[PDB]
């Protein structure tokens, strides 16, 4: 009920209105987002509370209610879609051919798409609609342009 | 702070998707803080 599959905004509020700090994915009863979005704070979902279950600052990932479930991988060849959920805007799909981050721990697909801070955690999809990673941990090249890793956890 | 979630959509690939962005090959390092940088 409070964990139905889908993409969700992560919001904060106090005694006034709400601000979107990120996005995440509900799959198999587990909520998935980036560590920098929530810092491991508990999340309200309707009348219920979701508590962090697993997370890792270096990977910049966190899961709630259970272990990380998303395991689809970019195939290194195909176009992908960012299902961007920008603050104040409807969810939208943006198709792109990833580049790569070449790292000492392997190649990571990387999308040269620039969306605001609160879009962090938006899912990146393969052609079957599976989530191959989350958007929003990236680099900035010399001219200022942004490139995000396709950040995926381990199931 | 009330941090909460609200539905934004169903997770699907959209065949009518705008295609954009380049495809860079970048040498990158990841530090223990979770920050990527260019090598």
């Amino acid at each position: 009920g409070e964990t139905t599959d889908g993409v969700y905004r992560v919001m904060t509020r106090r005694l006034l209105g709400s601000t979107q700090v990120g996005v995440g994915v509900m799959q198999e009863g587990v909520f998935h987002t980036m560590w920098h979005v929530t810092k491991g704070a508990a999340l309200r979902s309707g009348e219920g509370r979701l508590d962090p279950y697993w997370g890792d600052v270096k990977q910049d990932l966190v899961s709630y209610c259970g272990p990380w479930k998303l395991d689809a991988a970019w195939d290194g060849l195909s176009e992908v879609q960012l299902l961007a959920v920008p603050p104040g805007e409807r969810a939208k799909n943006i198709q792109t051919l990833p580049g790569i981050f070449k790292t000492k721990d392997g190649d990571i697909g990387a999308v040269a798409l620039d969306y605001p801070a609160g879009t962090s955690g938006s899912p990146i999809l393969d052609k079957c609609g599976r989530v191959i990673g989350l958007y929003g941990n990236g680099v900035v090249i010399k001219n200022g342009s942004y490139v995000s890793a396709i950040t995926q956890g381990k199931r | 702070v009330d941090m909460y979630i609200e539905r934004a959509g169903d997770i699907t690939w959209e065949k009518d998707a705008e295609v954009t962005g380049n495809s860079p090959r970048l040498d990158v390092a990841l530090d223990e803080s979770g920050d990527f940088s260019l090598v």
Partner: peptide, 6 residues
Amino acid sequence: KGXXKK
């Protein structure tokens, strides 16, 4: 980006 690279 825009909280830096996040």
